[model samples]
Every structure is written in structure tokens, then in C-alpha cells.
Target: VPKLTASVTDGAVGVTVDAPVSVTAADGVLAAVTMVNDNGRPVAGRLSPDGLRWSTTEQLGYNRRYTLNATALGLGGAATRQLTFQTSSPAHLTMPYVMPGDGEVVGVGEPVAIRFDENIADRGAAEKAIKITTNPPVEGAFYWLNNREVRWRPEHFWKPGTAVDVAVNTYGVDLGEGMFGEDNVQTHFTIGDEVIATADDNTKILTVRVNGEVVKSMPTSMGKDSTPTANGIYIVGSRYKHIIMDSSTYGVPVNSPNGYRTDVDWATQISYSGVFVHSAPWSVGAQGHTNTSHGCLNVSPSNAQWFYDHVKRGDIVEVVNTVGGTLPGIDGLGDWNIPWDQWRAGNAK
Candidate 1:
């Protein structure tokens, strides 16, 4: 008698969207094959010229059920087969949030940052989905800051004229524990001038340079002895004309001896841990000689404004000779502090 089989068993549930659905015949040839979706529409399919096999041509829909019917005929007898399968419905969906934004211009030190909405258990799968293409292509590596966030950077800072395009092709990809990636993302950006700002605690000075030429210098006071600023390369991020600097935001109570809530102007964010380069009128007397601020570069009003106006996201701020330890990569754009070999080996399966 004619025998028929399918890629998936009858009544199979939670099938992947990309599953190769097909039917085959043994001791016979397929006479007819039909697959219909729940909406009563026939799915696009193709039959082999020899009639021994039939397969769906288009991709399946997530969380949708499809029914398949096939008939086989031989000299001895005829047989029919029917099956139904349901595609996987994600219990949780995740997508990549990438930076710098489309059409943005960033500094040389800015890495390709990606943050997922869900804590990814299958980090390897997530990492594989992202594709980075750079003009005058450069070798880079991925470094996961945590379970949900990862970043990529070249062996060294990007060339000033490099253009970067990133594609996240994660749709229908299975993350662990029923979590799936349901959407894809793409972003394009360019590397701008090589702007680097060096803050030296010993000298109490902040120097800004572009393309290896010193452009500006400002006397500054850094973090105090008890709350020394972290030493590392920080990529400049957000900027604000004015902001309220609250000590309580970082865990120190406002009423504590070392805590104070104050407003600052020309604030430029350098780290996620509340470090900024901003105007500090109260610390003017100690700007060039002492470390008196909490954990920020205390610059005068004019200098702070000039720096704020000139800097853009992804610019580098390298802090050196601080009593505090180096900043963790997750704290900001401290990814530069990680050695290239370690960053490449950080892949977690």
C-alpha cells in the first residue's frame, strides 16, 4: 500500500515559524497535496516534478494553526494523510534597542550598543542575530554587559570616516524559556571627529582635543576623597542645559553629611552612575587644586558650557589617576577599559 509521511507529526504544537513543512511518499507518488490556514486559505506550496514530495513555499505565521492534506497512489492501493500543527506563540517577546540612532554622528570611541527588552538566556543565539557592517570593514567583537545588554567595538577606536550599519535579524528566533524575538531592527550611523577629553585628578585639569590637537583646557575639581570618581574611558551620552543633581539618587540620603541636592547648569552625562561634567559655582575656589565634588568634573560656568556645546554622544572622556577603581563596563561606555582579548572571549552560550 502507498505510505505517506510529513516533516512534523500529526497534531504537533508549538512548531517554529521557519519549520520546513513537507510531505513525502514511499512505495508511491503524491497525487495531491493541500495545506490550509485557519482562515480557510490555501498556503502557497510547491510539488516536486516527480510528484514524490510536496512542500510549503512561504514562511508560516506565529501562533497560527495550519492543516495539511496529502494523497498518494500506487499500483497496489491509495492512501491519504492529514495533520495539523500550531506555530509557537511566544510567552515573552524581545527586541533589540540599538545606538547610536539612525543618521547620528558619534565619536570614534562609541561602541555599537544593543539592549534587549527581556533578559536573554540564550546569549549565543541573540549575539548571532546581530550583524554589523562597516565601511573599510574592521574586525570587532561582542561583549555582553549582562544578560540583556551587549556591545560591539573594533580592536581600537573607529576611523573618523567609518560608516556603520547594524542589522538585528531576530524575528522568529527562540530565546530560552519560551521567549522569542518577534521583531528585527536596523540602524546606521557615522563616526565623527576623534574628540577626546582627558581629566587628570593629580593635575586637577580637564583637556579637550580633536584629531590629536588640544582645543580647550579648564581647571576642574573631581570627586572627593570619600567618593572618588571612577577612572576609565567614558563615552559621552546625554546632555542637558540644566539638571537637578540629587545625592539621594545615588543612595546617599540628602540629609547625610556628604549629601546635597543642587541644580547644575551645562550638564553633560558621562556615566550611568551619576557622573557628569557640569558647572559647580560653589567649588570654584578648589577647581584647580582640590577634589571636592561628589563624583563629577566640576568646571567653571563658561568652560562647562563650551564643553557641553562641543561634545556629542560617543565622545571620549578618559579619567586617570583616581583613587576609586576603574568603572565597570556596564556603568557606562567603560567598555573601552576591557582588553580586546577578554571582550572577544566574553561570549556566553
Candidate 2:
């Protein structure tokens, strides 16, 4: 007896539309194979270049059955075999789940997040599954961080008092290699009113803006000539209540040749690369006067505390001027810093 097995990449149990199939035999000669759609119409099939595999490009109808037949030419003339498989009912093409879950509140600086179970070989299909809608219609885009993850963010921090909805439609997505999507997701959240930050590279000062007005402007320091700070619009990214100050993190010396190696309590908001706006009480005198220290926006402990208290995660932080340094890319923090016109141009399609 000849052995025959059939399977699909994803979706419900059915063979329809762009589904791929393979058939193999151990001993008996496998000859011609034929396939018929639900309407009794013969569908075309082609053998692979190696002549050892076969496939069909025809799309299948939902909730319909397709019949397949295979013939073998062995020691005894030609023999035929037959099998029938049903396609699943038509379902939404998008998944019905959300990354952070619907209605879950997060810090203002939190990134618009997403994670997938497997690599998305079809980037176009994955992009179709994700949809972000916001009130006031902020200019945003989806970025493929990797095959398993994609994130979305606006040109800048989402405008205050805006509602955002994230919908995932993964119901019938083909993720490649006979793997169909299996879940659905959706999420909805609102942007809250909060503080904003603006960093000046020339003067080396960071200004805290509240509700569209500058409430405080503190003299700050950034990367030196060797390692200049990144220029562009940025958000808080993250804040550490108490983190160890380490030079090794950025390939600098902690002590000895580099100088100053101590574990300090830092209320810091890291927005661009290794540059941070943190408390450096020891460098208070150099905050506005001169650009000293490694690549950080040093501020007094008291100022840092006040800034930390007033700002939230999603708050905006704009950095302008830096002698002659390229703007930071959207990596650690969402790259809302890049200008709108330039960002839109980066999109291939």
C-alpha cells in the first residue's frame, strides 16, 4: 500500500487559496496527481523543478471540500488513489489579541509593543494584521524590529488627551512553511496629559514643558566631542529610581584613567543612546557652564527629583543641536525624533 499524508501551513482545516501541499512515496512509483475544487472544477498543479515535489497556486473557498487524486506507475501499469479534504469556514484575516492587552494602563514613556510566537516570514502579511488608530490622528508608523517583533509609535510622543486603538487580525494569516495563524488580539488605550522635555545641544540645557509652557529650564551636559549626544525628538524612554552608575555599560572607564567610579543613586531618564538626563550633584557647577562629564545631561539632585516627580513615561523630550552629530535612530526609545518628512521618506512603500 502507498502512503499519503496532507497538511496546510495555517488557518482552519481546509485546502483553499494559495495553500501548499506535498506528497511522498517510499516504494511504489508516484506518477500523476490531480486536484479539484469545491465546484468540481479541475485545478492546475505543477511539479517542482526537481520533479520530486508538486504544488498548486489556486485559492480555495471557505468551508468547502477539495478532492485530490494520485496515480502511481509501478511494476504493474498505472494505479490511482484518492482523498478529500475540507476547508474551514471564512474567518477574519486578522488576529483578535493585543500585545499589552486592551485597556491596560502603562507609563507615559512606554513603547507601543508587540510580540509574535514565531518569525513572520511574510512581512507584508504581518503588517496587514496590525492596525493602529488614534484620535486626532497622529502621524505614526510600524517598524519591524525583528522577525518576531514589530512596534508602532508616533512622530513624537502621542499628543496629550488622545485615544489609541490597536487591533490585531491574525485569524487566517499564512506565516510561511505550512504554519497558519492561530489567535486574534485587540487593545485600546488613551494618551494622558503630562509633562514634556526639550533638550538644547548648543546651550547644553534641558527644559521641562508642562501643558505647552516651559516650567523649568536646567543647565545640562551631554556627550563630549568624542561621543556627542544624539540630536532629535525623544521621549522619556525610561527612568531609574536608583540605578548603579557604571562606565563599563558605555565602554568608558569607571575609575583610574577615566576617573570617578562609584555606585550612585540616579533619578535618570535615558532617551537617546547612552546619553541620560540624570542627577549628577558632583558636577553641578558644570551643568550650564561647560559640557563636562561623559555623555549625560547632568543636573542637580534636587532638580532631578523635581523633574522625575512631574514627568510620566510618554512625555516628550526634544533634543536639538550637537556640534556635528547624527541624530539618534529609533532603537531603545521609539525614534519619534526624526523629522516627519524624512521619516515618511524612509518607508519603501
Candidate 3:
């Protein structure tokens, strides 16, 4: 008599979705094999050329049930075997949240950011599933900022007009700690012309450059001595026509000795710590000559309007010669401030 064996146990439970479902014959050549899901849909498979084994060729569904049947023939008789199994049911599912919305255009300083809703215990497993393909194929590496967030950036700033495509293929992937990937997602974004602004606190000037050419040179008032702006590269994040600039937002009381509430216009947020390049008409005289305002680049209404209209997400704004220290890599997209060697070494896997 002929006998058959299956990869999954006869009544196994909690099998992985990517299990290698296979059937082999013993003491005989395999004759037939079939695998189906609970809904009776056939699972595609391939039979070995030697007729000794059969295996599935398609991926399986998570938290689903499947059945496998196999038959083999020998010189005297034929035997059949069957097995059923259920895929694992994860407690939680996590999906990658990508930055620089799809079909959007961003500046060269933009880094590909991927955020997970749940903590990732196996960082390498999640990182390996995410793939990035650039138009000209620039080299890059993944740096984990925390258990839930990771970012990838090129060795140098991206080239203008470069195309980037990202794929987060984590569906059915085991991310550890009873969590599995929710689904697969992808996004494609374009890098627009290089828009860079450099602020020199010493000269109280902010200069804008596009494609290595000077575009606008505006006299600006940086943070006052006591509330000096941080010295580091900042990525343009958001723009607002008008906003209430309140000191209390950052823990200082408006009634405090060093606190005040004011109305601001044409504000472009550069750091998460409430630093902006905005219109400060009251500091117009001080601009270009002195440092005023609280941790912001104070510009005239006209200059602020020009910058607000021209800047987009991912644009670069570098601050230099400030009493304040360097911006931490965790603050905003300060990933560029990190050295390449250090960034590469910080990889989780």
C-alpha cells in the first residue's frame, strides 16, 4: 500500500499564513493533490515533475482555514490523505503610515518616513519588508527613531527631479509580540526643485536658494539672546496664513515676565518645538540688525509672504550662529543633522 504525508499536521492550528503547504508520497509515486480554503476555493499548487510531491504556489489568507488532500498509487494499491489547519489570528494589526502623501511633490530634504501604529519588536522584519526605489537609484539606509517610527534617507540630499517609490509589503508578516502586519501599502512622490533657506543669526539674515542659485535674500530677526533659536537644519513642515503665537503653548504663562501673546501672519513652521519663520511687523526695525522675537525668524510681512508662498513641505531651512545648541534628531525631521556613519550604525538590524 502507498502512504502520503503533509506539511501541516492532520488537525493543526495556528499555522502561519505563509506556511509551505506540501504533500509527499512514501513507498509510491504521488498521483493527485488538492488544497482548498473554507469557501471551497482551490489554492493553487505545483506538482513535482517526479510525481513525488506537491506544494502550494500561492499565498494563503491570515486567520483562515484550509484543507489539503493527497493521493498516491503503488504496485498493489492507492491511499489518500487529508489535513486541515487554521492560520494564526493576531491580537493586533499594524500598518505603515507613510509621509509625503502619494502623488505629492516634496523638497530634496524630505526623508521617507514610515510610522507604525503599534510597537515593533522585530524591527528587522518590518524594515526588510519596506522597499524604496528611486528614479536614478540613490543609496540610502533605514534608521529607527523609536519602536514605532523609522525613516530612510539618502547618503546626501536628494537630487532635484528625482522620483521615489516606496512599498510597505508587511501584510501577513509577523511583527512579533502577538502583532501582525495589517496590510500592504505603497506611495510615489516626486522631488521638486531644491528650495533651501539659510539663516545666520549673527547677520540676522535669511537667504533663499533654488537649485544652487540665490533667489531671495531677506533681512530677518532671529530669536533674542534669552530665547535663542536652535542651530541646526530644519525641514519646512507646515504653513499658515495667520496663527496665534502664544508663549503659554510651550509652558510659559502669558502673564509671566518673559511671556506674551501675539498674532502672527504668514507663518511657516520649521521645528516641532514651536519655532517658525513668520511676519513680525513690530520687529521690522530690528530685522537684519538685531535678534528679536522668541525662537523664531522674524521677517517683514512682504518677505514672510514671499517665503510662505514659495516654501513647501520638505524644503530645507538651516540655522547657524545661534546661542541655542543644535536641534536634536528627534525634533521634527532633524534626520539630516545626524552624521551618515552614525545614522547607518543606528539601524536596528
Candidate 4:
């Protein structure tokens, strides 16, 4: 029997591109072929003189449909055949700017930010997708955390009570070899005037800073001797909705039945490697008294909630108490654990 088949390397339905399909036949009887991309547009197919091979170089749209046809030459001159397929729709991309939307009040330490599901391959194309306009014109740049993520921040933090708009127009842009962006996205937020706490790993303490001035000081726990908290600058990672108090995900098991399985409403973010500022009510007495965590800064539930309520996503959280000093790394989660010189040296020019 003579047969024709096709496949795509990337994209869903209407939006597949780059990757193309190969065609083969059992009897070497396939003579000519044609293809219709997701948009139902005719895509002329090329065939080898032997009448057994065919190909096409066409870029497809996301979430679209396609069709293919072939004419088989047999003892009976030319017999025709056809086939069809579809692509998947685009999903929503999340942004890092954390506020209650535009015009909402935020603190002075807030910075404009965003995160992506996949590393962006095309820097210029990706930058064009991102649009940032502030009310007072702040000096800023888009820094790539890695291939899949990028963030934008001002020279410092935003001035108190400034309005910012972040727009992502990533529709139909080819990200890499076979990846194309699906849709456009946007977010708006405001900087409020409020005081927030700043924790430094170097000092191993939490300081209440108002307008950049230290007001109160309290010692804090961090990663143990072996698994130390990361050394550099970080931001308030996240707050917990609840602290489940579970056993460690790694290391030799410590026989504590009280070890938690999971904690809900845990608003946590990585400042150091596997280190976080989370709600550890049970660790309250231990917070300022002793450093007894895996490397996290544990605080009372009330204090955690207070910090949670007061802090914004991009607020800086600096750590500096280890022999290694600030692990110069990226901006989010465990990125700060890398030492400064090494982190800065690892970037592509």
C-alpha cells in the first residue's frame, strides 16, 4: 500500500513553524503533493524527482489547522489522497510586578518586574514585546535572569507613589529554533509610601527600615552550618498563608513526628539557596534567640503576616553573614546564593 504522513516539531495547531514533516510511501508510488497550513492557505509542497519524497518550508500560526494531500502513481496512473491537523491555543504568561493592579499604593522599595515560563531566545524581539513607561521617567534596564526569565528594574527602587505600566506584546514572535510566542499580556501597579523591614544575611538580622533608615534590629535564623543561606542581595520572597512545619525535603531524616508534611498559605520566596523568610510560629522563641533553621529566617506568624502585608515582591532582602559573603546571583528565589564575582562573571556580554 502507498501511504503519506506528516508531523511538526513545534507549535500547536495553527501556530506551528520551523519544524517540518517528512513523507514516505510503501510502494514508492507517491508522485506529487500539496499542503494547506492552519490558516487554510495553500502551501506548495516540493517533491523529489523519484516521486517518493516531499517537503515544505512554511511558518504556521499558533492554534491553527493544516491539511495535506498526495497523488500516488500506480498501475492506475494517479490516485489522490489528503490529511489534516490542528495546533493548540496560547496560554497566559505571568508577570512579576506584584501590586493590586494599577493606581494601587505601594512602598518606596517596589521595583518593576516580570517572569516568563520559557527562557527568551530573541533578546531584541522579547524586549520589543515588553513596554515599560513610568510617570516620572526612571532609569531602568531589562536584565535577563536566565534563558527563560528576564526582569526590569530602575537604578534603585521606585520613588514613593509612582505609577508604572508594563506591557508584553509577544504575539507571533519566534523565540528560538521552533518556538513562537502565543499572545500579548499587560499589568499595572503603583508604588505606595510605607516603611518595610530589611533583612541582611551578612548581619544575620532583620531591621525595620523606614525610607531607608534602620529603626529596629532583631537577630534571625538562617541555613545551618552545612547548608548556609545564600550570601547576596534578595527581595522579600513571599509570605505563607500557613506554616505546615514539615520535615526537610533533603538530608538525613531527623526523627521528629512533628515534622510537617506540607504547609498551606506559606508565602515564601528564595533569598538564599533553599533559604526563605517564612512563618515559623513554633520557631518564634528561636528566631532572635538561636539560629535553628535549615537556613530560613523563621518568624512569628503575626510578624510574618505583618511583614507579608507590608512587603512587596521586589523589595530588596540582603544577606551577608557567611564566610562566602553575598552569592552574587540573579534577582529572584535562590539566585542570590551565588557569590558576587562568580555571578557577575557568568553572564553573557
User: Which is better, 1 or 3, measured by TM-score?
Assistant: 3
Candidate 4: residue 110 Cα off by (Å) = 4.6
Which portions of model 2 miss their true places by more than 4 Å? 1-111, 136-139, 154-157, 177-182, 247-256, 259-261, 339-349
Lowest-lDDT window of 10 residues in candidate 4? 91-100
Those runs of model 3 whose alpha carbons end farther than 4 Å from true positions after fitting are 1-15, 18-60, 68-83, 248-251
TM-score: which is higher, 2 or 4? 2
RMSD of 4: 12.9
The lDDT of each candidate is: 0.88, 0.64, 0.88, 0.59
- Tell me the number of clashing residue pairs for each predicted model: 0, 26, 0, 49
Q: For model 2, how does the per-residue alpha-carbon lDDT over 1-349 read when each residue is reduced to its tens digit?
A: 4444445422335444434555554345567777777778876667655434566655445566678777655454655667777775543332323444467544344456667766666666766767778888877766655566666776655666677788776655665454456655777877776576887877777888777788999888766677667666555656777767666766876655874555545566665455667788888887887776566777888778777777765566676787645555555564565566665554323
Tens-digit per-residue lDDT, 1-349, candidate 4: 4554555422334533424555665554677677776556776566777777777755455566777777776663556776666754444332233233555555454545555566555666676667888887786666566776665556555787677888765655565444556555677877765455655655557886767687556567666566566566565545556656456665424466545465634455645345667777666666765666666767666656566666666565666665444554464543434443544343433
Ranking by TM-score, best first?
A: 3, 1, 2, 4
Error of 1 at 316 (Å): 0.3
Off by over 4 Å in 1: 1-15, 18-36, 41-60, 67-86, 250-256
TM-score of each: 0.80, 0.64, 0.82, 0.58
